[PDB]
Amino acid sequence: SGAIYVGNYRVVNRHLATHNDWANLVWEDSSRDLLVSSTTAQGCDTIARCDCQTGVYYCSSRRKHYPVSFSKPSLIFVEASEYYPARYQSHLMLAVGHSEPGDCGGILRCQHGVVGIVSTGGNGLVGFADVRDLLWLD
Ligand SMILES: CCCSc1cccc(OC)c1NC(=O)N1CCC[C@H](C(N)=O)C1
Numbered sequence: 111s112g113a114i115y116v117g118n119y120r121v122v123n124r125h126l127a128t129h130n131d132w133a134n135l136v137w138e139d140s141s142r143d144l145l146v147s148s149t150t151a152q153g154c155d156t157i158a159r160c161d162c163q164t165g166v167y168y169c170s171s172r173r174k175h176y177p178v179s180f181s182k183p184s185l186i187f188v189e190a191s192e193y194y195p196a197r198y199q200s201h202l203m204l205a206v207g208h209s210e211p212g213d214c215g216g217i218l219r220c221q222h223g224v225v226g227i228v229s230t231g232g233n234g235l236v237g238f239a240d241v242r243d244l245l246w247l248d
């Protein structure tokens with residue numbers, strides 16, 4: 111679990127959005143596993159506007175932050191799960207690092223701010239949904 115709170119927006123993994131997120135929907139994209147909902151209070155986060163490929167992410171299954179080198183946002187095949195059919199997920203960045211089901215929503219940050227959130231993983235990999243191209247969040 112986890113979310114980004116910026117301005118009057120809450121960014122979450124689309125597959126973990128709540129009834130409240132859908133009732134206050136701003137934008138969603140199943141191909142990116144992202145959903146943004148509106149909030150009444152001002153958020154705590156700021157968004158990176160950069161091309162960093164190194165950063166640090168929070169891994170809830172280890173209660174720890176890990177440094178990572180991650181690929182540029184791209185279209186990557188993601189196998190079927192209880193949440194989605196087998197498909198290509200766009201704007202996804204992969205890295206070698208631990209992750210397991212439950213780690214989605216953990217934030218990835220570089221020196222400039224929030225880069226994205228954990229969205230996929232497996233066998234020593236962790237995938238992050240990029241949010242740096244969503245300029246309207248600011
Ligand atoms: C219960 C799923 C076990 S596979 C796994 C194994 C290790 C880490 C994992 O995520 C952090 C995952 N989970 C996973 O990749 N997805 C399941 C939820 C929806 C994700 C998506 N964006 O399509 C894909």
Ligand SMILES: [Zn+2]
Pocket residue numbers: 158159160161162220221222223
């Ligand atoms: Zn950066």
